[PDB]
Structure 1
Amino acid sequence: EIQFLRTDDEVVLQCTATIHKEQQKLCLAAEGFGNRLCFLESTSNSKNVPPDLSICTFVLEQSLSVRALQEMLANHRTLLYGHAILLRHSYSGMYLCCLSTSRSSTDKLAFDVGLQEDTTGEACWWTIHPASKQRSEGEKVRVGDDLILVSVSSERYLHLSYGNGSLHVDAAFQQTLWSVAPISSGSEAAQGYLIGGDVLRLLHGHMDECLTVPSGEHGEEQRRTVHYEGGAVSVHARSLWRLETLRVAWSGSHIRWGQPFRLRHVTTGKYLSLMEDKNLLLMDKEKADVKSTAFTFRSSKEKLDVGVRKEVDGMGTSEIKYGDSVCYIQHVDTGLWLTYQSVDSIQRKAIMHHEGHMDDGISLSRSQHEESRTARVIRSTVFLFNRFIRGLDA
Structure 2
Amino acid sequence: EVQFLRTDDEVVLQCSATVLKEQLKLCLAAEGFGNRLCFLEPTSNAQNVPPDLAICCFILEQSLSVRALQEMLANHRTLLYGHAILLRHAHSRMYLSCLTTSRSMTDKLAFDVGLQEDATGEACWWTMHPASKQRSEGEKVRVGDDLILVSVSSERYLHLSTASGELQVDASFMQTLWNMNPICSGCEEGFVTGGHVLRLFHGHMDECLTISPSDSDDQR
Structure with bigger gyration radius: 1
Match of 1:107 in 2: 107
Alignment of 1:248-287 (within 5 A): none
1:216 to 214, 217, 220: 214
Tell me the amino acid that sits aligned with residue 223 of structure 1: Q
Match of 1:171 in 2: 171
Tell me the amino acid that sits aligned with residue 144 of structure 1: G
Distance in 2 between residues matched to 1:164 and 1:122, nearest whole Å: 29
| Structure 1 position 70, deviation (Å) | 1.0
| Structure 1 position 108, deviation (Å) | 1.4
Tell me the amino acid that sits aligned with residue 139 of structure 2: E
Distance in 2 between residues matched to 1:167 and 1:135, nearest whole Å: 28
Tell me the amino acid that sits aligned with residue 102 of structure 1: S
- SS of 1:159's partner is strand
Tell me the amino acid that sits aligned with residue 164 of structure 2: N
8 Å Cα contact 1:95-1:118 kept in structure 2: yes
Structure 1 residue 86 corresponds to structure 2 residue 80: no
Distance in 1 between residues matched to 2:50 and 2:94, nearest whole Å: 24
Structure 1 residues 259-307: Cα deviation after superposition (integer angstroms, max 9, x where no partner): xxxxxxxxxxxxxxxxxxxxxxxxxxxxxxxxxxxxxxxxxxxxxxxxx
- SS of 1:127's partner is strand
Alignment of 1:126-275 (within 5 A): 126-186=126-186, 189-217=187-215, 222-224=218-220
Match of 2:50 in 1: 50
| Structure 1 position 121, deviation (Å) | 1.0
| Structure 1 position 105, deviation (Å) | 1.6
Distance in 1 between residues matched to 2:169 and 2:63, nearest whole Å: 23
Which 4+ residue blocks in structure 1 deviate beyond 6 angstroms?
none
- SS of 2:209's partner is strand
- SS of 1:199's partner is coil
Distance in 2 between residues matched to 1:130 and 1:208, nearest whole Å: 52
8 Å Cα contact 1:10-1:58 kept in structure 2: yes
- SS of 1:96's partner is strand
8 Å Cα contact 1:213-1:223 kept in structure 2: no
Tell me the amino acid that sits aligned with residue 199 of structure 2: R
Distance in 1 between residues matched to 2:160 and 2:38, nearest whole Å: 11
Distance in 2 between residues matched to 1:63 and 1:82, nearest whole Å: 10
Distance in 1 between residues matched to 2:104 and 2:49, nearest whole Å: 31
Q: TM-score, normalised by structure 1?
A: 0.55
8 Å Cα contact 1:215-1:223 kept in structure 2: no
- SS of 2:85's partner is strand
Distance in 2 between residues matched to 1:185 and 1:104, nearest whole Å: 35
Distance in 2 between residues matched to 1:76 and 1:211, nearest whole Å: 37
Distance in 2 between residues matched to 1:207 and 1:136, nearest whole Å: 57
Structure 1 residues 21-48: Cα deviation after superposition (integer angstroms, max 9, x where no partner): 1110000000021111100111100011
- Unaligned 5+ segments in structure 2 are none
- SS of 2:71's partner is helix
- Unaligned 5+ segments in structure 1 are 225-394
8 Å Cα contact 1:57-1:90 kept in structure 2: yes
Match of 2:116 in 1: 116
- SS of 2:73's partner is helix
Match of 1:7 in 2: 7
Tell me the amino acid that sits aligned with residue 169 of structure 1: V
| Structure 1 position 87, deviation (Å) | 0.5
Alignment length, in residue pairs?
220
Structure 1 residues 216-235: Cα deviation after superposition (integer angstroms, max 9, x where no partner): 12x5x7133xxxxxxxxxxx
Aligned-residue identity in percent: 79
Which has the higher relative contact order, 1 or 2, with Cα contacts under 8 A spaced 6 or more apart? 2
Tell me the amino acid that sits aligned with residue 218 of structure 2: Q
Structure 1 residues 80, 205: CA separation in 2 closer, same or farther (over 3 Å shift)? closer
| Structure 1 position 111, deviation (Å) | 0.4
Tell me the amino acid that sits aligned with residue 99 of structure 1: L
Distance in 2 between residues matched to 1:223 and 1:208, nearest whole Å: 25
Match of 1:75 in 2: 75
